[PDB]
C-alpha cells in the first residue's frame, strides 16, 4: 500500500473547480464539454494596442493559468490567436502568430507536463460575433487554448 | 433497359426510364420494351404488360 | 455470490450473443477452433533469427456433438 | 393573347391554343372549354362556375379564390402556395414542384397527385384534402377540429392533430412522428392483403 | 389546471394559479413568479436536470442525453422528462428570430449505416417534437451524425456513454 | 446416470437417448448434480443429490 | 453555479465492464464476418416468394421462446386459425430455436423462423388452402 | 425443502381475491372459468373518444391490472379489441388494431413473463349487446385480455 | 396517476452497450443466415399435387414403420382404386415410418412422396381409378 | 515470463514477440522485476511481483 | 509497406520549430528504416518502409 501512490501528485479537484469558478468570475472563459477543455482570454487583458508586448501585471494571471493547467494530465495542447481586421491579412496573421508563439514558449518554459504544444495565429478570419465596434477592445480579438483530458 | 413508375392515376401512368425518358400512358397502348399494357391498378403500384412484366416503384 | 446473482440477473443477452447453434455444421458436428498470429519473429541465438508474416494453427480438432454448449460451464 | 376577363354568364370554347402567358379573370359563370396547351402564371376565378382545362405546361402559377368553383386541371405545373377560405373544390392531374404550402379554412375538397418533395398543410375546419397518389419526401401537417387529411409521404412525416381530425397515410415512410392532443387520430388505413407489403423496421416501430 | 401530457401542446397558464393561491398578495405573488421566471433560474433548473448549456458569442447551444431523455434503441419518447421538456420550450421561446440547427450523435459500435439511420431518425423525431410546439418549418434543419467526431473518448465505457448526445445550436441573426 | 422424463435436456451432454411412442424420453449420460431443461420455451434448472 | 456533465446512471460492475470489452470485439468479428460473406456470395433467393403473406396474418405477436419449434408453430397455427401440417421425421437430435422479438407480423415471424432453421427444415404456406406446413430435411 | 421454495415468489391468494374484488367493484369484468381467465374492459374507461390516445389518470388502473396479471404463470396471452361503428370497417379495424397494439406493448413493457402475446382487433364485427345506442359509450366497445392458467 | 418506468430498464452504461451489442450481433447472424440459406421456388417444387378425388377425403389412424408397396396397395384397396408398379425393387427395399392419428389420404400420399426421395415416385389417375409407383434407375 | 499488453516494452530485451489483429503484443522473456515502457511518448516503469 | 517486428523508436527533444524542419529532423533521425514524402498539391504526408531482409 504505502509504496504505490494513491492519486496523481499535487492534484485536488476541489481546488481545481474553485479556481475554475474564480477564473470564470474574473472573466476568463472556461469551457468543459466532454473530455475537452477550452480557455478563452480577451486580448486586451494580455497585450498592448496591436503589439505583442506582455503586461507586467499579466504575469500573475499567466501564473494562475499555468497553476490550473498543470493539475490535469495531458499530451498535446494547442493555442490559437485571433484579432480584428486592421491593415491586411498579413499583418494581422503575423501579430496573432507572434503572440501565440511567445505565450506558448513561456508556457513550455513553465512547469506544465505535456508532450506536444502546437501554436498558431489566424489573424481575423473567423470571428465569433458581428459586433465589430471596438478594435483590440472588441471580443473577437482573443486567444484560445485547447486540450483533451487523457485517461 | 428498365422503366419505373413515377405517378399513378386511374387511367394514366407515368414512366421514367433508365435513359431519363419520361412518358404518360393510357390504360392500353403499345409501350417500348414491354409490349401492351392491359391493367392499371391504382390501389397498389402494380401494372402488368403483354410481356408479363409488372412495373413497381423504384427503390 | 454477488457476481453470480449479477450474472443470473443479466440473463438473456448471454445466450443472445453466444448463439452456438448457428455455428454447428449440417451433420451436427462441432466446428474446430483456429488460432491466428501475425508478424512473428523468433531469435534462435545470436546471428540467427527467423520471421514469418502470419501463422495459423489448430487449437482443438473438430468432432461430433449432441447438444450445443452454453456460457454456464464457462462463466459460472 | 395577354388578357381575358369575362363577366356575365357566357361560354367560351376553344382548341389548339399556344401562348407564353396570359392572365384570366372569370366571374359570373364563365363556362370555359379549352383543348390546348397554354402556359400561364395567374388565373383568378371569383367562384360558382365550372372550368375545363386539359393541359397547362407552365413553369409556375398561383391560384387564390374565395367562391365555390368546380375546377379540374391537367398539365405539369410547379406551384408555390394555395389558400382556401370558401367552399372550394379542385382536382389536379400532375404537379411537379419542390415545396408547397396549403392552408384551408372553411371548406376544401382538393385532390392532388404528383411528385413534390416538400409539403406543408394546415387545416382549420371542414376541410378534406386528398394528396393520395401524391408522393412526398417531406411532409408537415397540422390539423384542427373536423379535418380530414390523406397523405402519401415517402421519407419524412410530421403529423400534428388537435382534435376531431383524421390523418390517413398510404405509404410507410422511413421516418414517422405524430402527436394528437384531444381527439386527433393517425391511422395506417392500408389493405393487409398486398403480396408485397413491407412491415416496420427498428427505426420505424414508432408506437403511438 | 394542467394536463401532464404537454398540456395538449397548448400555451400554459402557470403563474396565474401561483398568484391566485398567493392572494388566497398579488404583488408578492408576481415578484415570486418573475423570480422563478428569471432566465438564470431557467438555466439553474436545466442544470438541475442533466442538460448542458453553453453560451458563446452570438451562438447558444444545448446538450441533451439520449439515454436518459429517450427510449433505448428506439425513437420512442421517454415520457418521464416532460418537466425538463417544458423548461426547454420555455427557454426556446425567447428567440423567435434565428434559425436553429439540431444534431444527433452516437457511440462507435455497430454498422455505420445503422448508426446513420438511428441518428437521422433520432434527429428527425426530435425536430418533429420541436415543430409540434409551433416553430416555422423553414427555420429548421436536422442532422444525425454518426461517430464522426466524438466529443468524448470511446475507449472507456464511461466515455462511450458520454459520447451519445443531442446537440442544439442557434445563432442570433 | 439414466433419467426417464418427458422434457428435453440441454446442457451437460448425453451419451444416448430413447423416445417412446408417447414422446417420453430416457437418457444415459455421465453423472451431474445439475441439469438444464427447456420446459415450455422457458429454461429451467434441476438439482441432483445423492451422487 | 456548479458544473455537471449530462450522463448519470446507476453504478456498474467490473464483470459487466469485461462483458462489454468482450462484446465489442465479438460484434466487430461478426460485422466483418457478415460483410465478407456478403462480398463472397451473391444472394439470389428470397423466402418471401415461397411464404407470401395473407389476410388474418397481421395480428401482432411479441415472443420470447427458448426451446424447440413444434409446440411454437402449433401455437402459431392455432392463433392463425389455419391447419398445420408436418412432413418428414423429426431426427434424434432436437432442433432448438431461440427467439426474442417485439410484436411484428406473422409472415415476418415465419420468414425469420425459417431463416434460423436454415438447412434443418423448410416452411411452406398455402393461404388458398389455409395450411401452414413444416418439412424436415432428408439427409444422412 | 429448507433449500427449496415453499411457495411461488410474490404469491398471495388473499391478495388475488382482494384485487379481483376491487376490480369487480370498479366494474372491470373478471371472468374465471376452469383454469381459463378473461378480463373485459370498456373502451371509454381507458381510451379517449374514437382515438388511440390514453388518459394520464388511467395509469393507476393499468398498473393494477398488470400487477394482477404478473401474479399467475402463463404461456400465451390474447388481446382482442372491439369498437362501435363509426366511419368504415377499415377505419374501425385499424383503430382496434392500434389500440390493442399500444396496450399490448405497454403490458409487455411491464414485467409479466409471458412467452407469446397476441394482439388483434375487429371493430364492430362481434358486438355483445343488441342495445347499440352509444358509440364508445356503449359497453360492446371493449378490450378483452384472456389466457389459461397452466399448473 | 403515475406512469411507471419499465422493470427491465437498461439504466446502466454497461447494460446499454451490452444490449446494443446483442442487437448488432443478432442482426449480423440474421443477415448471415439470409445470405447463407438456399431455398426453392414453389413453382417447381417437386411435390405430389393433390388430385382431390372424393375417395381421399376420409380420415384414418395409422402407425407403421416398414416397407412401402404393401402399404400403398392397402391404401388403394381402402380407396377402392387399383395398384400399378413400374420398375423393380432394389436389394434393400425403401422403408418409411408413418405414425398418425388423423390425416387426409392425399396428405399421407404426399408425405410418402416426400419421404420417398428421388429413387421412387407416384402418380394418380383419378379418371381410370389407379395409383402407380415408379422406380428410378 | 510471458506478458500481454498493447504497450511497448523498452528495457530488458525479450526472447520473442508476437501481435494480435488489434495490435496487442505478447512477449516471452526472462524474469525481471522492473520494466521500462513508453505509454504515449512518455517513459514509465512497471512492477513485476511474485518473483 | 509494413512496420517490422522490431519497432522503430524515435527520441525528439526540440522546441519552437516549424513543421517542415520538424519533418526533416524526423527523417534525419529515422535513418534508412523509412522515408517521408509529401504532396502539397494533394495535401498528403506519406511514410514508406524500407524493403530489406
Numbering used by the authors:
A (entry chain DK), H (entry chain EK): 38 to 188
B (entry chain Ef): 208 to 266
C (entry chain MC): 77 to 152
D (entry chain EM): 113 to 320
E (entry chain EL): 42 to 65, 88 to 236
F (entry chain FH), J (entry chain EH): 311 to 361
G (entry chain ED): 23 to 162
I (entry chain Ed): 24 to 160
From the paper:
Legionella pneumophila is an opportunistic pathogen that causes the potentially fatal pneumonia known as Legionnaires’ disease. The pathology associated with infection depends on bacterial delivery of effector proteins into the host via the membrane spanning Dot/Icm type IV secretion system (T4SS). The Dot/Icm complex of L. pneumophila is one of the largest known T4SSs. The Dot/Icm T4SS has as many as 300 protein substrates, a striking contrast to the H. pylori Cag and B. pertussis Ptl T4SSs, each of which transports only one virulence factor.
Using 3D variability analysis, we reconstructed a total of five maps that displayed differences in the way the outer membrane cap (OMC) and periplasmic ring (PR) were positioned. These maps led to the identification of an approximate 16-fold symmetry about the center of the dome positioned within the OMC. Within this dome there are 16 α-helices that appear nearly identical at this resolution. Indeed, a model of the C-terminal domain of DotG generated in Swiss Model using VirB10 as a template fits into the resolved dome density. However, we have unexpectedly uncovered that the Dot/Icm incorporates only 16 copies of DotG into the OMC dome out of the 18 DotG copies in the PR, giving rise to another symmetry mismatch within this system. Based on the structure of DotG modeled within the PR (residues 791–824) and the homology model fit into the dome density (consisting approximately of residues 857–1046), we hypothesize that DotG extends from the PR to the dome, though a physical connection between the two structures is not observed. (A) Two DotC were observed in the maps that were reconstructed during 3D variability analysis, one which contains an N-terminal extension (DotCLong) and one which does not (DotCshort). In contrast, the N-terminal extension of DotC was modeled as two relatively large helices positioned near DotG and bridging adjacent asymmetric units. Notably, this portion of DotC was only observed in either four or five of the 13 copies of DotC observed in each map. The movie shows that the OMC dome, OMC disk, and PR of Dot/Icm T4SS can accommodate various orientations in relation to each other that suggest that the complex could undergo a ratcheting motion, in which the dome and PR rotate back and forth about the central axis with the different regions of the complex tethered together by the physical connections across the symmetry mismatches.
